[PDB]
Symmetry: C3
Subunit: 403 residues, 3 copies
């Protein structure tokens, strides 16, 4: 027939890695460091580098078992290899931060089970296998819980107690993938935050990179340069926070995401000219792109301030998440966020007042604090906006009644 | 091959509209009013009518931008048009209920982004775009939050703070659609009630109409005349409440749903002979169909009363929803519902008692109030049903212990 | 084309039944009893047997209506038949445990609606029909709620107030099924525990058996012998608890699951040589297989004890479920479970201490009770593990601070 064709399911990958066929490739490049693998026919070597030299010294390994998957954190180095006709699939952990004399452990998966993806969390490690199993391990080598995956894994990321799994929930058509996300919190109270929700992607695009921001919010990038971030303040939906194609000059130009930071806001990525991944040598330079939510009429003052407001809102939801889970957060960052947002609301209200859009001013005042609304009332008494001042006063009464 | 064939995904639509190819078509017909579009080669006009003349005067617009999507509420008129080679896709709002002198605003979507569906809520508006984005706007023109859709939108509806999105979650086979529902509450505490649950449809049918009842419960109709309603009292499942094919006399006869009302119960729709949608002229007459849940042996007294009981139960769940969300509800309606249900239970218990089904009587008494159970005990002492009276007494003891 | 092919959706089935084409087949074989159907051209008979003769006497029925689906519980016998050109699809219940003189009821489904699956709960019965409807009935014959199914049903099971539905959520490819699970609790507070989550299956396998353990935990088996159980302590994920292929000697050997028991742990199944289901005559013998979670390096002492620990953890989650839902549970079973787990942790800590893996000892002590940690501190003071004793002491301080 001549209709829709099933899209081939994309293969699993480690975020921040370059393809396996390269002689000198990146196994992982994140906010902790870089892991490179030089593999020809004579020898196979793995080199580990840390951005902060104080964390650990540079580590060089002789890749005898031919490790093809790697992840790096401030605690350990995680390595994995598939099975051969003689050896089993192995998970290798270099626990360099351990305070004891045993800084290494390795485990063999059962017969005919191959590791397809790994990720490192805070004090734990996870491995998705060809048996549609997810195996949890402590950073010291204890086997934790095991559960089955609803489909073949695509990529896996970890941060703190959070586990971020993207897998094939179905079969897409006409170039589209059919991906689902399983988001778990592996603390003392186990929670499945997302029960295989559909992962939004740009049409005819595939998954290019997943992970967490340094502050601990799940994020991912598709092959069309669209960067999306979990919106905890919007029912755990996914909000686009950047479009790396706006910084590209041609079709063959791409950006290779390395890390995401919310405070200060910066998207650390490698500019790539001619391909989607940078060559290992010479050392590529990390670029810093700004985040921009895809808002309408962003060239106008209204659209510009509206984008700044909602970007400030979503990039400070992590403070509430750190508070709800007992983590440590700076109360000063929370206060600066509110002041930054109340200033943008006040400037947007003054703009709507100049445009004789007084109903819009009351809508903006609904997002304001009680102090900001009281200030907007006196600004409305000024400039002879008498009815607007009355509507704002009635809004201030309603806000005080909500307490 | 000769097997299952992929079903073509149905295109987005506005509920209560007639096809675009008509010279004189309905853009939207709901419980607020009617919006018609007359478009030939000479001129293009849009006419707005309100069922209640006291709400607003009849509005006539010169459709210069060729708006093809429309929605209507007691607050504003929402219009949208796709992009051309010279103009961008635009969202136009006629805020006629505004108390200020600015009763109009329009916004341009970014390049190559087209509006595919719109809907109006209480004080807000939403637009699903070709970029798989959902854009939220206040009724006054402020851009609110934005998040990505898991698939191409099919239809969109709003009521109060609720957002009702139906989209393609996959690809169906053999005439079946693969639809998912995302139900959000956009109040001060954002909630995603349904994380893309599968939307039940009749086999080989497509989505024909979605929306909310006047009381605020999500409902939808498929192409086979099956009307389904969210059952908040049954874990947010979907319960069939009507079958418009029972009122049709032939295959070519159809009913075109306009609105759904829970108190009093009535399904307002347009009878259509020969097609699925009514012609614009002459003005079609609104028919009132009754709701009937698809219960077994409904011709018998037992099945008839069982259908009346569960229809009364599901059509009063909205009272609990209005109470939990601080909305205003009549306590008298809640009391009349319970009295209506306790009377049906009492008549079903008397029927089971006549049939010497005393175990069934105790099952019916489990659904009764403590006062109704006490009354059933004295009715069981009467007519010499001594063991039944003892079982009902032990049930009354258990009910008092649950407090 | 030459690519992925759509997998034909498997047909609905009753768990514990043998195919319909057999002259003498099992309609259901569970922990309550056996129901056999002998059907040739001369006569059609249904025989009911109870494992405990004290429950009820053996029942013999003349299958005049040609019932093809059956389920059995300690309360009633449930039978169902499809519709013919003269008769409707019927649901027949033999309420043998009733304390009244009416121990039978039957109901007719509407025109062109056929029963596809049934299941028995505590005091209720459910039937999934060809109209994509789920109909609830009390054990005495009262019609309860009705809601629509997101797809064609595959199998259905019930236990207490829990309803376990597996259905087709999509179309799989290359031999894979696309199954979803809807898990409901039908008590006085209706809950949808699983909103159509994807059902994990072994690749290229189909669903072979579903049901609940005697303690009330959902479980299911695929065609590759993998037995999975709901992990309530792991965010309602699914954990493999057995692999019946490890007990098979050849490809043609299979195990036919009958029941699952958590305390004592035993998987009751019928060994089958040459086919997937046992012949009705002679009476097959019920085998008892042990549960084994698929852990790595299970031949070693570490892997063996780690498997025993997590098997003990998951097979005692039902005690917490019985407690949260007011059911009756033995506090002695909960105490024996903790003692069994603290002993395994203590032996694993002593093993890690012998291997000079002191960081791993602290990880194991995190899973210990406060008394077990205090004991591990004195064991660390012994054998001159001074730093380990300090780390365990700081862990004991942190545990006391969590109260």
């Amino acid at each position: 027939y001549d209709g829709p064709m099933p899209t081939p399911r994309q293969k699993p990958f480690q975020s921040g890695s370059t393809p396996l066929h390269l002689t000198h490739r990146f196994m992982v490049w994140n906010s902790i460091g870089i892991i490179r693998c030089y593999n020809d026919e004579q020898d196979n070597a793995i080199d580990v580098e840390f951005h902060d030299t104080s964390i650990h010294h540079a580590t060089h390994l002789s890749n005898t078992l031919n490790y093809t998957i790697a992840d790096l954190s401030h605690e350990a180095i995680l390595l994995a290899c598939e099975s051969t006709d003689e050896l089993a699939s192995k998970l290798h952990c270099l626990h360099f931060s351990s305070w004891d004399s045993s800084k290494e452990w390795i485990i063999d998966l059962p017969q005919n089970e191959d590791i397809e993806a790994i990720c490192l969390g805070q004090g734990w490690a996870a491995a998705a296998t060809s048996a549609l199993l997810l195996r949890l391990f402590t950073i010291g080598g204890v086997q934790k819980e095991v559960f089955s995956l609803a489909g073949p894994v695509v990529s896996m990321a970890g941060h703190g107690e959070q586990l971020f799994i993207v897998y094939h929930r179905g079969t897409g058509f006409d170039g589209d993938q059919c991906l689902g996300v399983q988001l778990l919190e592996l603390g003392k109270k186990k929670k499945q935050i997302l029960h295989g929700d559909p992962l939004p992607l740009t049409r005819k695009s595939y998954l290019a990179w997943i992970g967490f921001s340094a502050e601990g919010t799940p994020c991912y990038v598709d092959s069309e340069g669209i960067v999306r971030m979990l919106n905890r303040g919007l029912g755990n939906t996914w909000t686009p926070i950047c479009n790396t194609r706006e910084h590209c000059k041609g079709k063959s130009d791409h950006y290779w995401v390395v890390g995401i930071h919310e405070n200060p806001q910066q998207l650390r990525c490698i500019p790539c000219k001619g391909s989607r991944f940078p060559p290992t040598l010479p050392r590529p330079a990390v670029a810093i792109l700004s985040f921009k939510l895809p808002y309408c009429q962003i060239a106008t003052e209204k659209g510009q301030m509206e984008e700044q407001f909602w970007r400030s809102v979503i990039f400070h939801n992590h403070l509430d998440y750190l508070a709800k889970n007992g983590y440590e957060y700076e109360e000063s960052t929370k206060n600066q966020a509110t002041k930054e947002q109340q200033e943008l609301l006040m400037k947007m209200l003054a703009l709507s007042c100049k445009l004789e859009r007084e109903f819009r001013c009351v809508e903006l005042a609904d997002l304001m604090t009680q102090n900001a609304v009281n200030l907007a009332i006196k600004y409305a008494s000024r400039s002879r906006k008498l009815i607007l001042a009355q509507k704002l006063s009635e809004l201030a009464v309603e806000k005080a009644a909500e307490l």
